[PDB]
Tab-separated table of C-alpha atoms in Angstrom:
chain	number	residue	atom	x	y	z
I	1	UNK	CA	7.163	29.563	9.096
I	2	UNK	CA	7.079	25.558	7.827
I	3	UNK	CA	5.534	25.434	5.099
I	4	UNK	CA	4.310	22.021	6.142
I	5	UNK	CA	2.222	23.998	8.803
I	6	UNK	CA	0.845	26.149	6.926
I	7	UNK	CA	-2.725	25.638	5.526
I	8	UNK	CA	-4.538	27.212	2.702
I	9	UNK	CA	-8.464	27.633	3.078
I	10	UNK	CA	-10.636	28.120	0.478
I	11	UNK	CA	-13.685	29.958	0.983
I	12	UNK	CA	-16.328	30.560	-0.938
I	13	UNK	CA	-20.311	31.891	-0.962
I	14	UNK	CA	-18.704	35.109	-0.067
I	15	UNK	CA	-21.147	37.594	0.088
I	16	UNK	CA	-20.528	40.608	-2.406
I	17	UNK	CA	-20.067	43.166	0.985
I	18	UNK	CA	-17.039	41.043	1.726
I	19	UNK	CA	-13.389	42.066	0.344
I	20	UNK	CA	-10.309	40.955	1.439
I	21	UNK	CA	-9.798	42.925	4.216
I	22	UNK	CA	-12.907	41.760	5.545
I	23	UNK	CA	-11.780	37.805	5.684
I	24	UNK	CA	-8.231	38.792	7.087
I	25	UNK	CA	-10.130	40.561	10.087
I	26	UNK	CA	-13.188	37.848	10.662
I	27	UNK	CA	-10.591	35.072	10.375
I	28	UNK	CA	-8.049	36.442	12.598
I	29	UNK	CA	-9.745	35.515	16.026
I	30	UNK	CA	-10.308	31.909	15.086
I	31	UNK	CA	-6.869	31.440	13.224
I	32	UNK	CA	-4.010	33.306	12.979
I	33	UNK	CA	-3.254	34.149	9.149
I	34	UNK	CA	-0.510	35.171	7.282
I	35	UNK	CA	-2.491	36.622	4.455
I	36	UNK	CA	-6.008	36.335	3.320
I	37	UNK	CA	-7.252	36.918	0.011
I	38	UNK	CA	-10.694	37.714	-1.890
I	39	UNK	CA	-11.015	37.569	-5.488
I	40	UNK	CA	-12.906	40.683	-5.540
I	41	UNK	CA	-14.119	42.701	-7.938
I	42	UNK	CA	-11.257	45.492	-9.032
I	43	UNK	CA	-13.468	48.347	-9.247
I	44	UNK	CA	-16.425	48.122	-6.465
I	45	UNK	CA	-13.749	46.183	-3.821
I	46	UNK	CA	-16.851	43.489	-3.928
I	47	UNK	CA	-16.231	39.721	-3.611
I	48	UNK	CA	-17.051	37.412	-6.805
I	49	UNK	CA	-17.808	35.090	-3.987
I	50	UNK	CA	-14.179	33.097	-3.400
I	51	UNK	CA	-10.825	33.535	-2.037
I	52	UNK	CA	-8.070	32.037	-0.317
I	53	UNK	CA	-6.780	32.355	3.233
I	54	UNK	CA	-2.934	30.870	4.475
I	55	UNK	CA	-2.793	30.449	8.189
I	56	UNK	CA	0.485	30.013	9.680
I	57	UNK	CA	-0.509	26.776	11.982
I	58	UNK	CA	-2.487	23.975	10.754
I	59	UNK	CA	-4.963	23.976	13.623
I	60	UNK	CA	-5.748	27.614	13.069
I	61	UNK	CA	-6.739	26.802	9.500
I	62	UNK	CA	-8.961	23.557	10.846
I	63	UNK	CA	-10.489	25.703	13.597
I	64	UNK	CA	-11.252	28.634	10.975
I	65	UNK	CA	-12.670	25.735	8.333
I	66	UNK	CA	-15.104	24.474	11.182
I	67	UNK	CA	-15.738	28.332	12.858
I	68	UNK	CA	-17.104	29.859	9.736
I	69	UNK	CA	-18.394	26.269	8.205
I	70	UNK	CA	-21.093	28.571	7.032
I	71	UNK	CA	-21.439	31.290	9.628
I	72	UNK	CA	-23.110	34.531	8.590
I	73	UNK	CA	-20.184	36.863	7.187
I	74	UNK	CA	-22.261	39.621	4.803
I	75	UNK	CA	-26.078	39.189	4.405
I	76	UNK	CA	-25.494	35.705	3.668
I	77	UNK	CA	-23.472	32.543	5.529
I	78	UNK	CA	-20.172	31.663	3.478
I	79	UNK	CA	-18.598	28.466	2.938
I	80	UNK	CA	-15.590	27.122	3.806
I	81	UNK	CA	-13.533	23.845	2.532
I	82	UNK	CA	-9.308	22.840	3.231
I	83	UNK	CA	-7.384	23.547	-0.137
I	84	UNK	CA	-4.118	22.125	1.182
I	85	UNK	CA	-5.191	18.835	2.045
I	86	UNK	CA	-2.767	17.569	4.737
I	87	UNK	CA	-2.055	13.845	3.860
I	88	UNK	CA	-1.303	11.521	6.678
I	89	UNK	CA	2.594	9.844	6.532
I	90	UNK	CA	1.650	5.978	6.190
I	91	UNK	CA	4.580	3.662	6.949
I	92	UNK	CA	5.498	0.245	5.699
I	93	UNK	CA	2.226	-1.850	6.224
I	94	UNK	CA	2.400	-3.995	3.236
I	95	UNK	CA	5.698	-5.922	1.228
I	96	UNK	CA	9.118	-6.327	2.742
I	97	UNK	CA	9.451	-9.314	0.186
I	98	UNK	CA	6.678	-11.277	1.696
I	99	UNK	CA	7.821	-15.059	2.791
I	100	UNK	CA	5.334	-17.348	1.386
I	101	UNK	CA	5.602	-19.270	-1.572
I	102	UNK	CA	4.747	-17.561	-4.457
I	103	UNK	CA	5.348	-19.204	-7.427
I	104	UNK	CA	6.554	-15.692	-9.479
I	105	UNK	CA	9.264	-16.132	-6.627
I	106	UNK	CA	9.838	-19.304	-6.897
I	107	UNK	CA	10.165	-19.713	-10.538
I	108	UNK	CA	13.020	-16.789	-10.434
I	109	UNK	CA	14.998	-19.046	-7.900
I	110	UNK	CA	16.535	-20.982	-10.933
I	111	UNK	CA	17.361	-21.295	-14.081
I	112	UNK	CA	14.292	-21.856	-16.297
I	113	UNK	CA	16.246	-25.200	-17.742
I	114	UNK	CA	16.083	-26.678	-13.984
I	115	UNK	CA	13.606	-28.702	-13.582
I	116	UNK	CA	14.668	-30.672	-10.271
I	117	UNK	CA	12.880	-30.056	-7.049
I	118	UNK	CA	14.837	-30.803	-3.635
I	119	UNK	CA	12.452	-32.980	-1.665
I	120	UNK	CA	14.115	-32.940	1.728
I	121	UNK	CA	13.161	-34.063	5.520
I	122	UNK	CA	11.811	-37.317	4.836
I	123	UNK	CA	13.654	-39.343	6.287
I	124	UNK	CA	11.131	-42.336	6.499
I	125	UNK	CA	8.555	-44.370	4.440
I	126	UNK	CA	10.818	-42.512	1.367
I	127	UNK	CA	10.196	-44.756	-1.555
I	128	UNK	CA	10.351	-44.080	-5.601
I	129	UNK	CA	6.358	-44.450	-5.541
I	130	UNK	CA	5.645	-42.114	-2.238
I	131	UNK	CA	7.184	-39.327	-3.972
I	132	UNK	CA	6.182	-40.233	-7.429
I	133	UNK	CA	2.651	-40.262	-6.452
I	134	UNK	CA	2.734	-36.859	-5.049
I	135	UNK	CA	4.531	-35.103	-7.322
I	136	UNK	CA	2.586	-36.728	-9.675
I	137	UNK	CA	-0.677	-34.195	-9.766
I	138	UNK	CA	1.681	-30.970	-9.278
I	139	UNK	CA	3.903	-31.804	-12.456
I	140	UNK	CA	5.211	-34.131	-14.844
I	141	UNK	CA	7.798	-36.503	-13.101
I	142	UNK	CA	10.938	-37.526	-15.140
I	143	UNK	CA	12.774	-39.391	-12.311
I	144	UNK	CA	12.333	-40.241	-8.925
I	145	UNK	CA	16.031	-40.596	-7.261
I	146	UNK	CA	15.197	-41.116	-3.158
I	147	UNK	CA	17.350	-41.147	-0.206
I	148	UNK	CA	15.490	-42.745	2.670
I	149	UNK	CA	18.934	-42.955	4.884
I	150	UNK	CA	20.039	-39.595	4.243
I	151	UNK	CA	15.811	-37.895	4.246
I	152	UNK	CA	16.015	-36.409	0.532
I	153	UNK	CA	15.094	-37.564	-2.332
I	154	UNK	CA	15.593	-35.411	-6.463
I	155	UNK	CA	12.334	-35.354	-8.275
I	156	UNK	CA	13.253	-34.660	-11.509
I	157	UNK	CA	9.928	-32.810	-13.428
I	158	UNK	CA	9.483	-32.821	-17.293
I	159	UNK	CA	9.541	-29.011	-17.358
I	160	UNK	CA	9.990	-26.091	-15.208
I	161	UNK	CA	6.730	-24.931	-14.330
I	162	UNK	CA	5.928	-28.272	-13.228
I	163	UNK	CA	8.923	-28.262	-10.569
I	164	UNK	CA	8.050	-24.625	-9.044
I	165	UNK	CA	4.324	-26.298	-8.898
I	166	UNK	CA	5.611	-28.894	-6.915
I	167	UNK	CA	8.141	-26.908	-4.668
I	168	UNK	CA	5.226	-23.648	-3.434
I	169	UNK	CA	2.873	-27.013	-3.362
I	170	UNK	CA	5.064	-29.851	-1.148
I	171	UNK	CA	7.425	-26.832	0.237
I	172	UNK	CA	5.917	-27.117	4.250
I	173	UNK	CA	3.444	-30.343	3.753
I	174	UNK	CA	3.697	-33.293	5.934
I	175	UNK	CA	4.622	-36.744	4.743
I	176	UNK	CA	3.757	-39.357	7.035
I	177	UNK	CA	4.788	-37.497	10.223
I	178	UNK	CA	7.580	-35.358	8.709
I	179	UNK	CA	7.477	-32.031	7.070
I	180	UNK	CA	9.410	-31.800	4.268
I	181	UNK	CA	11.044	-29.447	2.778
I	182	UNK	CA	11.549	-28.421	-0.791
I	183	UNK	CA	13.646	-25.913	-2.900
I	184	UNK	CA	15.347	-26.354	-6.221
I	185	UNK	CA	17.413	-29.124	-6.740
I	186	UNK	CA	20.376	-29.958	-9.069
């Protein structure tokens, strides 16, 4: 059938009575198998205490696993443990290009000779200093060019690690009542 369907068993703690034969038949009312096989001994048809068993349906195989999960087959109780371990499909759970502001983003946004971070959406109390003094801590500030009338303003940083600093940093802050904005700049 599918080969997605079917399951391999491996058994083991076989007792030495046991031979292939023996698993195909003890197996067959639990879970319906294709083949069944005992490494047995060539000569004497007796078990070296292992095998494999392929069911044709994957509950079969499960059933079997739990069934004989150490039930009495031979003078002794045999184990049992899934060789073809079925692994669960997952689906997209994590990354999709995450939208946050990660700096590693950020910093591939421009050229690393950019240093000028778009300050945009304040369109009041905009003065050299305001910006100056926030920008300040993030990065080196070069100029200050602001544009109260128009709500932007061009900080200009000393180098380019500075300005993504300042852009994941200011990027969705508040400045006296207005959330700015910022990106790279020209």
């Amino acid at each position: 059938g599918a080969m997605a369907n079917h399951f391999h068993v491996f058994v083991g703690d076989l007792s030495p009575e046991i031979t292939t034969e023996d698993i195909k038949a003890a197996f067959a009312p639990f879970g319906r198998i294709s083949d069944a096989r005992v490494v047995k001994d060539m000569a004497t048809g007796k078990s070296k205490g292992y095998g494999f068993v392929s069911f044709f349906n994957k509950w079969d195989a499960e059933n079997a696993i739990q069934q004989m999960g150490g039930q009495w087959l031979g003078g002794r109780q045999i184990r049992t443990n899934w060789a073809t371990r079925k692994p669960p499909a997952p689906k997209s759970t994590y990354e999709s290009n995450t939208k946050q502001l990660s700096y590693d983003e950020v910093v591939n946004q421009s050229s690393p000779s950019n240093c000028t971070v778009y300050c945009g959406g304040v369109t009041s109390g905009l003065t050299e200093q305001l910006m100056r003094q926030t920008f300040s801590p993030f990065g080196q500030i070069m100029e200050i060019r602001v544009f109260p009338d128009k709500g932007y303003s061009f900080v200009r940083f000393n180098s380019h690690e500075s300005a993504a600093h300042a852009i994941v940093s200011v990027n969705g802050t508040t400045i006296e009542g207005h959330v700015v904005k910022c990106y790279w700049g020209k």
